[PDB]
UniProtKB/Swiss-Prot annotation:
Organism this protein belongs to: Gallus gallus (Chicken)
EC id: 3.2.1.17
Taxonomic path: Eukaryota, Metazoa, Chordata, Craniata, Vertebrata
Other noteworthy facts: Lysozyme C is capable of both hydrolysis and transglycosylation; it also shows a slight esterase activity. It acts rapidly on both peptide-substituted and unsubstituted peptidoglycan, and slowly on chitin oligosaccharides.
Domain C-type lysozyme stretches: 1-129
Gene it is expressed from: LYZ
Tissue: In the egg white and polymorphonuclear leukocytes.
Name of this protein: Lysozyme C
Length: 129
């Protein structure tokens, strides 16, 4: 599923991501924009053989099981395919674990490089929330 900007904002809010660990909703929308272009089915293979999955490009090295990332963990206790669903629940639940793990949203390199320090409220501006 490819979300609209305000549509994703609303779904993230419903699932408790707004201000989660102090990160306002626009941070999460900005991160999803640059990680996946709002596409739940996005996947990208990393140089190390791990893969990033879903709207927030969660990595199989640590967070989900895809069966083809040796030595990896599955800290969200989910198949990586669950992160590709039209329903964002699994991605949100796992993102909550990630952002709680010490480095906040810096875990998402696109957030650090393209969202951090910017006017992230612009991502939810105009949306009925
Ligand atoms: Na894994
Ligand atoms: Ru804009």
């Amino acid at each position: 599923k490819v979300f609209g900007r305000c549509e994703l904002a609303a779904a993230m809010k419903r699932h408790g991501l707004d201000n989660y660990r102090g990160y306002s909703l626009g941070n999460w929308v900005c991160a999803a924009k640059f990680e996946s272009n709002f596409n739940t089915q996005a996947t990208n293979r990393n140089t190390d053989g791990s893969t990033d999955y879903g709207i927030l490009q969660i990595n199989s090295r640590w967070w989900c099981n895809d069966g083809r990332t040796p030595g990896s963990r599955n800290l969200c206790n989910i198949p990586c395919s669950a992160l590709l669903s039209s329903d964002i629940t699994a991605s949100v639940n796992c993102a909550k674990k990630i952002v709680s793990d010490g480095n906040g949203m810096n875990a998402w390199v696109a957030w650090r490089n393209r969202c951090k320090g910017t006017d992230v409220q612009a991502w939810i501006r105009g949306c009925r929330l």
